[PDB]
Amino acid sequence: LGINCRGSSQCGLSGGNLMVRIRDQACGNQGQTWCPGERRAKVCGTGNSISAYVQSTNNCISGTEACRHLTNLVNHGCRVCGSDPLYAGNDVSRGQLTVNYVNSC
Amino acid sequence: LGINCRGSSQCGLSGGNLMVRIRDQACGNQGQTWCPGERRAKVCGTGNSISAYVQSTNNCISGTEACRHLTNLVNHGCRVCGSDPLYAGNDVSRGQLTVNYVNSC
Numbered sequence A, B: 001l002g003i004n005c006r007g008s009s010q011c012g013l014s015g016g017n018l019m020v021r022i023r024d025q026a027c028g029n030q031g032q033t034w035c036p037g038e039r040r041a042k043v044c045g046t047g048n049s050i051s052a053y054v055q056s057t058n059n060c061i062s063g064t065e066a067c068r069h070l071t072n073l074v075n076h077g078c079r080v081c082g083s084d085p086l087y088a089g090n091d092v093s094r095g096q097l098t099v100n101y102v103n104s105c
Helices: A018-028 A063-076 B009-013 B018-027 B063-076
Strands: A041-044 A049-055 A082-085 A096-102 B041-044 B049-055 B082-085 B096-102
Touching: A018 A041, A018 A049, A018 A063, A049 A063, A063 A082, A063 A096, B009 B096, B018 B041, B018 B049, B018 B063, B049 B063, B063 B082, B063 B096
Parallel strands: none
Antiparallel strands: A041 A049, A049 A096, A082 A096, B041 B049, B049 B096, B082 B096
16 A cells, blocks of 8 residues: 555545645744644634644655645645655555645644 | 545535436346446536446456445545445556546536
8 A cells, every 4th residue: 555545534624635735834844843743723613623643654744745645635636634654666555655634733 | 556536626525425326227227237437327417427337457357346346445534435346456558447527427
């Protein structure tokens, strides 16, 4: 399982392309380091959000890399949620940047 | 380019899990064969639709195969539009089942 648009049923939103907004946040600040679990880019609703974060690994990635993975998600057609494997050719369980619904902002 | 959720911007405006409904139509009628360009499963709006059809090849596929490809799209996380290559380890360039917005029902 490589790049995909899987996510929580809450990701089912018609209209706004939230992935684009999340990508723009990441690409606008490429200086930060993205470590596991850190929701460094997100779009908040009331008491919730669609957040981007690294998971399935103990490794960290550069802000430049995060920008690239989010651009990959937009180009793949994921409008709200999805995940991109961190390592080329590898399954997402070996490390992935995921954008998904979170029960807080 | 393999399985993906790319589609017209209109896809994102549509509400509901249209991909599931389209899959349901195809899987409920596996007897029909799908030839290039035939919009065999679709959910119409007023003057338009989200339709599924084979493209990028001269071949026709069985309804059982169309059901399989549409299930692949549902499992990939594509809520409304996307495409699945028909042939193993191939680029959608050699044949794909596409679900996309069409300006007619």
